[PDB]
Curated annotation (Swiss-Prot):
Monoubiquitinated at multiple sites by LRSAM1 and by MGRN1. Ubiquitination inactivates it, possibly by regulating its shuttling between an active membrane-bound protein and an inactive soluble form. Ubiquitination by MGRN1 requires the presence of UBE2D1. It comes from Homo sapiens. Residues 5-148 form the UEV domain. The modification N-acetylalanine is found at residue 5. Transmembrane segments: none annotated. This is Tumor susceptibility gene 101 protein. The chain holds residues 1 to 145 of 390 of the full protein.
Length: 148
């Protein structure tokens, strides 16, 4: 029904250096088919060691209902080149008009912490599952504020 953003074939070229390419591509297709404001992008990730690698991330918004409105929560999900056997590294990405609300699941840099990420195991864990969890958690406790 809706338009295509990126195809499987194009994605496969983007993750050409990933160790488990078909698995990564299939899950990415399922995510962006369902969440149409999440876009796959190739970008440089800087680890704590100082090393950097070109990684695909999913960036955009997911829809989260909260007290009578539906909010588009901006997120970024980085896929390591060993995806799906390591969890994504996940961030909320506030605009200039937003603040990060820190708590048990979100730090001051916007990094997300979840049992689902800590317990990650393929094939029981996957991105679709992760996003459902984020929607529940963020629906209970919004991770970005924009008004008093």
């Amino acid at each position: 029904m809706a338009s295509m953003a990126v195809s499987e074939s194009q994605l496969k070229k983007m993750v050409s250096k990933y160790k488990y390419r078909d698995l990564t591509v299939r899950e990415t297709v399922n995510v962006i088919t369902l969440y149409k404001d999440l876009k796959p992008v190739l970008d440089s990730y800087v680890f704590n060691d100082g090393s950097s690698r070109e990684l695909m991330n999913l960036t955009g918004t997911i829809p989260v209902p909260y007290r009578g409105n539906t909010y588009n929560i901006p997120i970024c999900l980085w896929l390591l080149d060993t995806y799906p056997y390591n969890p994504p590294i996940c961030f909320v990405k506030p605009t200039s008009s937003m603040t990060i609300k820190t708590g048990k699941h979100v730090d001051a840099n916007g990094k997300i912490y979840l049992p689902y990420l800590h317990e990650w195991k393929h094939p029981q864990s996957d991105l679709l599952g992760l996003i459902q969890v984020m929607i529940v958690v963020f629906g209970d406790e919004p991770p970005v504020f924009s008004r008093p």
